[PDB]
Design an enzyme around this catalytic site. Sequence first.
Site, PDB file in Angstrom:
ATOM      1  CB  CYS A 175       2.788  29.568 -20.869  1.00  0.00           C
ATOM      2  SG  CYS A 175       4.255  29.138 -19.861  1.00  0.00           S
TER       3      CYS A 175
ATOM      4  NE  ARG B  76       2.485  26.440 -23.709  1.00  0.00           N
ATOM      5  CZ  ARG B  76       1.700  26.355 -24.776  1.00  0.00           C
ATOM      6  NH1 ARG B  76       0.631  25.565 -24.775  1.00  0.00           N
ATOM      7  NH2 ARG B  76       1.988  27.072 -25.850  1.00  0.00           N
TER       8      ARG B  76
ATOM      9  CD1 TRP C 182      12.741  30.074 -15.314  1.00  0.00           C
ATOM     10  CD2 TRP C 182      12.232  28.492 -13.797  1.00  0.00           C
ATOM     11  NE1 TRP C 182      12.800  28.852 -15.945  1.00  0.00           N
ATOM     12  CE2 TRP C 182      12.495  27.868 -15.037  1.00  0.00           C
ATOM     13  CE3 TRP C 182      11.898  27.694 -12.694  1.00  0.00           C
ATOM     14  CZ2 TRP C 182      12.421  26.484 -15.204  1.00  0.00           C
ATOM     15  CZ3 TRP C 182      11.828  26.329 -12.865  1.00  0.00           C
ATOM     16  CH2 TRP C 182      12.088  25.737 -14.110  1.00  0.00           C
TER      17      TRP C 182
ATOM     18  CD  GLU D 119       8.117  36.839 -17.723  1.00  0.00           C
ATOM     19  OE1 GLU D 119       6.981  36.916 -17.192  1.00  0.00           O
ATOM     20  OE2 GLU D 119       8.916  35.905 -17.477  1.00  0.00           O
TER      21      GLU D 119
HETATM   22  C1  HEM Z   1       8.823  27.507 -15.270  1.00  0.00           C
HETATM   23  C2  HEM Z   1       9.160  28.649 -15.871  1.00  0.00           C
HETATM   24  C3  HEM Z   1       8.133  29.504 -16.640  1.00  0.00           C
HETATM   25  C4  HEM Z   1       8.492  30.403 -17.561  1.00  0.00           C
HETATM   26  C5  HEM Z   1       9.950  30.676 -17.988  1.00  0.00           C
HETATM   27  C6  HEM Z   1       7.289  31.024 -18.087  1.00  0.00           C
HETATM   28  C7  HEM Z   1       7.233  32.001 -19.056  1.00  0.00           C
HETATM   29  C8  HEM Z   1       6.132  32.795 -19.296  1.00  0.00           C
HETATM   30  C9  HEM Z   1       6.096  34.114 -19.904  1.00  0.00           C
HETATM   31  C10 HEM Z   1       7.290  34.927 -20.448  1.00  0.00           C
HETATM   32  C11 HEM Z   1       4.828  34.519 -19.939  1.00  0.00           C
HETATM   33  C12 HEM Z   1       4.313  35.872 -20.493  1.00  0.00           C
HETATM   34  C13 HEM Z   1       3.923  36.720 -19.283  1.00  0.00           C
HETATM   35  C14 HEM Z   1       3.588  38.118 -19.715  1.00  0.00           C
HETATM   36  O1  HEM Z   1       4.080  38.515 -20.793  1.00  0.00           O
HETATM   37  O2  HEM Z   1       2.847  38.840 -18.994  1.00  0.00           O
HETATM   38  C15 HEM Z   1       4.006  33.491 -19.331  1.00  0.00           C
HETATM   39  C16 HEM Z   1       2.637  33.527 -19.181  1.00  0.00           C
HETATM   40  C17 HEM Z   1       1.868  32.516 -18.632  1.00  0.00           C
HETATM   41  N1  HEM Z   1       2.339  31.374 -18.032  1.00  0.00           N
HETATM   42 FE1  HEM Z   1       4.248  30.702 -18.082  1.00  0.00          FE
HETATM   43  N2  HEM Z   1       6.189  30.465 -17.421  1.00  0.00           N
HETATM   44  C18 HEM Z   1       6.685  29.528 -16.510  1.00  0.00           C
HETATM   45  C19 HEM Z   1       5.914  28.763 -15.643  1.00  0.00           C
HETATM   46  C20 HEM Z   1       4.542  28.699 -15.658  1.00  0.00           C
HETATM   47  C21 HEM Z   1       3.716  27.953 -14.730  1.00  0.00           C
HETATM   48  C22 HEM Z   1       4.342  27.137 -13.575  1.00  0.00           C
HETATM   49  C23 HEM Z   1       2.427  28.144 -15.076  1.00  0.00           C
HETATM   50  C24 HEM Z   1       1.131  27.586 -14.457  1.00  0.00           C
HETATM   51  C25 HEM Z   1       1.099  26.549 -13.622  1.00  0.00           C
HETATM   52  C26 HEM Z   1       2.408  29.010 -16.242  1.00  0.00           C
HETATM   53  C27 HEM Z   1       1.296  29.443 -16.945  1.00  0.00           C
HETATM   54  C28 HEM Z   1       1.238  30.638 -17.617  1.00  0.00           C
HETATM   55  C29 HEM Z   1       0.044  31.362 -17.983  1.00  0.00           C
HETATM   56  C30 HEM Z   1      -1.416  30.907 -17.730  1.00  0.00           C
HETATM   57  C31 HEM Z   1       0.432  32.487 -18.586  1.00  0.00           C
HETATM   58  C32 HEM Z   1      -0.491  33.580 -19.177  1.00  0.00           C
HETATM   59  C33 HEM Z   1      -0.712  34.616 -18.075  1.00  0.00           C
HETATM   60  C34 HEM Z   1      -1.349  35.844 -18.661  1.00  0.00           C
HETATM   61  O3  HEM Z   1      -2.205  35.704 -19.576  1.00  0.00           O
HETATM   62  O4  HEM Z   1      -0.998  36.963 -18.206  1.00  0.00           O
HETATM   63  N3  HEM Z   1       3.712  29.330 -16.559  1.00  0.00           N
HETATM   64  N4  HEM Z   1       4.839  32.451 -18.958  1.00  0.00           N
HETATM   65  C1  LIG Z   2       0.786  39.322 -16.707  1.00  0.00           C
HETATM   66  N1  LIG Z   2       1.428  38.009 -16.505  1.00  0.00           N
HETATM   67  C2  LIG Z   2       2.603  38.195 -15.643  1.00  0.00           C
HETATM   68  C3  LIG Z   2       3.421  36.974 -15.571  1.00  0.00           C
HETATM   69  C4  LIG Z   2       4.058  35.989 -15.439  1.00  0.00           C
HETATM   70  C5  LIG Z   2       4.753  34.906 -15.404  1.00  0.00           C
HETATM   71  C6  LIG Z   2       4.242  33.827 -14.696  1.00  0.00           C
HETATM   72  C7  LIG Z   2       5.004  32.674 -14.541  1.00  0.00           C
HETATM   73  C8  LIG Z   2       4.417  31.512 -13.798  1.00  0.00           C
HETATM   74  C9  LIG Z   2       6.287  32.615 -15.071  1.00  0.00           C
HETATM   75  C10 LIG Z   2       6.781  33.732 -15.743  1.00  0.00           C
HETATM   76  N2  LIG Z   2       8.031  33.697 -16.276  1.00  0.00           N
HETATM   77  N3  LIG Z   2       6.022  34.848 -15.869  1.00  0.00           N
END
Ligand code: HEM
Ligand SMILES: CNCC#Cc1cc(C)cc(N)n1
Lengths: 412, 412
Positions: free
Chosen positions: B109, B112, B281, B286
């Site tokens: 992520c 973070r 958000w 994405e």
């Molecule tokens: C607040 C704004 C956030 C942004 C801008 C962001 C950004 C991202 C992005 C770009 C990805 C890649 C997704 C993909 O390529 O499929 C991702 C994955 C992930 N995010 Fe964040 N995220 C945010 C919030 C969060 C929150 C609130 C959580 C959990 C409480 C979180 C946990 C994760 C996890 C576990 C993944 C991996 C999911 C997967 O393996 O498909 N994120 N995030």
């Molecule tokens: C396959 N993972 C899809 C996704 C996603 C994702 C989730 C969150 C919390 C934020 C973000 N910017 N993107």
Amino acid sequence: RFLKVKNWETDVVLTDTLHLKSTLETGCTEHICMGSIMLPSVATKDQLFPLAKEFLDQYYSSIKRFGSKAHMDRLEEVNKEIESTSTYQLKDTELIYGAKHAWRNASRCVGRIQWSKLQVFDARDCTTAHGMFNYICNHVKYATNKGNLRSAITIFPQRTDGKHDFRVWNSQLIRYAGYKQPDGSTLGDPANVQFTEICIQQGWKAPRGRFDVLPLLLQANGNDPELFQIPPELVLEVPIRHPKFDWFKDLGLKWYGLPAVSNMLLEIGGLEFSACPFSGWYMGTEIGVRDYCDNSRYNILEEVAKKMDLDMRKTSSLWKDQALVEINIAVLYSFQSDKVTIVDHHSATESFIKHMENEYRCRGGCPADWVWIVPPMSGSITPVFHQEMLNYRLTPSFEYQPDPWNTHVWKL
Amino acid sequence: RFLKVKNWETDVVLTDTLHLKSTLETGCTEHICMGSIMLPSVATKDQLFPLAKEFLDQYYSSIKRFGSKAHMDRLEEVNKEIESTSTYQLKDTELIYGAKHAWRNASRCVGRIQWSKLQVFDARDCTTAHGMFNYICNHVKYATNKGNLRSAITIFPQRTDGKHDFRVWNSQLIRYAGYKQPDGSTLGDPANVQFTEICIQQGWKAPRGRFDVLPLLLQANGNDPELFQIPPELVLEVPIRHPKFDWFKDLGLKWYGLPAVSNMLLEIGGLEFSACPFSGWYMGTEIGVRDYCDNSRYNILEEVAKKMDLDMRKTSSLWKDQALVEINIAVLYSFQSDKVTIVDHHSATESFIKHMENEYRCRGGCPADWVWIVPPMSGSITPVFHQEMLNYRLTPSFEYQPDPWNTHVWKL
Ligand code: HEM
Ligand SMILES: CNCC#Cc1cc(C)cc(N)n1
Ligand code: HEM
Ligand SMILES: C[C@H](O)[C@H](O)[C@H]1CNc2nc(N)[nH]c(=O)c2N1
Ligand SMILES: C[C@H](O)[C@H](O)[C@H]1CNc2nc(N)[nH]c(=O)c2N1
Ligand SMILES: CNCC#Cc1cc(C)cc(N)n1
Ligand SMILES: [Zn+2]
């Protein structure tokens, strides 16, 4: 133990058994992955025959005479010569095999579909830096082939005691000079500032401009190195123009056509070739993305955005992205219209997927470093983004080695 | 054992000690690296108190009462309750800590820097699918906040025996439907075709169009799941327009504003929360890169190249690249002009470098997955390309889990 890798665009799965023959260590453990670390981390006879034997068993398995008398007597022969000399000498056929397979095994190289078409120049009779200059010039002229680039490697004598090393001190045979400025900024290529300084320290007289080809700094038999200037008629260059934007010429950019890495170490059967310059042809993004737009390189995104009239105040206008595409359309366009060999990141990554297929079919695997295989722009619209890859270290191999001006027991 | 990571754009080095507390296994060995493999790979009381103890020792170390009586008695209390029940229940304060640190530890992520600003919705009193629908709707409305998006997670009851699982069957709370065609092609989103079919199997009546929001498929206490439709007034959508190209509207594209992953598993102190939808958000890429231009997704590079008038016969014209930038300028532009929160891949990757700095400073490290952190376009002109990263598994964590329609001992 017999692992699977998936492509998440085509759902193709392939099974890797080649990694079993892997020998060296990766840097990763069961609890930490170093797949994004750039450089993770003298020899005796007892260590040397296993490596010799392992290499010979695969060479003879290759020419389909595994276990013949010729194999057995070569085994005996090399053992005896390592008894006799505490080292040994490769046959010409073994050098060509070993060099072609070091490239084949180079997990960071997207170009390996060509690995069997390598011209090998045996320079193991070289004894002086002038001799190296002469061998290198012949390599440059051959590999350039009037813009119809041809893959080649030149192999200087192997390391012996360790204080008699052949080394090309430049990181590439052909690089542009890097000079800093009184106002602190930089002319030319900032990557090469410390090397450019060393050349002047050894008496290089610098035309302090931008695209000033650097002289060769060649060290023979552990001797202090010497400067030589490549005949400029031998350094082929491409002037970079855009197929739409006529102001592109006023940028006054060019690049050299021959990518030729000169700072790595070639390992074959346990023998170490500290000077082994090798060349292919460019993938456009190496020039148009990294060389031109890396912040610590030429860093020209500024002026291409400017002369394109772009929203440069907002980070989210993607003005950097949009200028980056035009630069790479131009690099490609200019090389092609000059009949100088270049490959675009779409064609090169497609070929590596196809190459990977052949390797799993007739070899059981293909070591590949995703962090390096994926191009540095437009990654996910090329098929290697969606291709899982296993990285593991096979030998023969190309290895990194310290910069020589930190190793050299210099006598000045 | 106390490893260093370098940034090869700024020469900054930082030292990682956090990886020592790493517990789970990565998939890599000393002889093979799986850093590009996407998904590498019931509980008893004997296993459960160590995990409980380890989590409680870091929670109490966090609120700066490590080793107090309140810590010692909570330790005793949970041990006794795992003696009594062979499981245990988290305090509200412990759930919020555990959830915030699962995000913090999520090495894939890039977002973070915000990990401490997470709104946690305790849904552990939920007993029915209607209850889940109601909790989820409240989550969607809160997290959307009229386009001023707010991070949130809703946590349903923890797994008990394993045959009583709460599960959101959708992969995201809000996804577009995927229907195949008689001519074999696909309308909507090809990623969701098998899920869309399951919804119709359970009686969903489909408006067989493109951007048809899918219904929720909620399973409570291991019971067969049930369909519910999110009040459309609660599903905020952004119509995508270009700030230059007026033909962009005729493409008729929109996306939903709330990214909300619903298929993962939240692990805290050894307890397993199989339904834990979480939202933030979007980063523009994405949508604009993966959702729109993945070959096996919407795959719209065709028509954006067409309506731009581009050299589509030559692979090396970079027409794919050039259309890809315009699509992402438009995604960003449309979200911003609607006051719907979105971040561009330059701002988001800069913030993650800054976040990484804080983590090495006040935590001793930051687990990061380079393969996932680097954006899927323009990679090397963002600072995370040039940043070495160590990947290792810390807990609390978000984990992948099988799709429920392959696990479920269904009773129909
Ligand atoms: C607040 C704004 C956030 C942004 C801008 C962001 C950004 C991202 C992005 C770009 C990805 C890649 C997704 C993909 O390529 O499929 C991702 C994955 C992930 N995010 Fe964040 N995220 C945010 C919030 C969060 C929150 C609130 C959580 C959990 C409480 C979180 C946990 C994760 C996890 C576990 C993944 C991996 C999911 C997967 O393996 O498909 N994120 N995030
Ligand atoms: C396959 N993972 C899809 C996704 C996603 C994702 C989730 C969150 C919390 C934020 C973000 N910017 N993107
Ligand atoms: C024939 C056309 C070739 C193409 C298109 C090609 C492509 C590439 C590219 C794009 C890189 C990444 C370079 C960087 O990002 O710094 C690379 C690296 C590499 N290539 Fe190839 N290559 C070719 C030929 C060769 C040959 C002939 C050899 C050796 C005999 C070779 C061995 C390597 C090695 C060892 C590396 C890694 C160098 C490093 O770590 O900096 N390649 N290649
Ligand atoms: C094979 C490869 O691991 C796979 O395509 C990954 C690469 N990196 C990624 N990175 C992100 N953020 N999202 C992804 O879906 C992927 N896909
Ligand atoms: C930190 C990271 O490993 C480093 O910047 C790498 C990433 N991938 C790369 N890939 C290629 N082909 N060339 C490079 O110089 C790099 N740099
Ligand atoms: C830091 N490595 C620079 C490089 C390179 C390279 C080398 C070869 C043989 C081909 C190519 N296309 N590129
Ligand atoms: Zn690894």
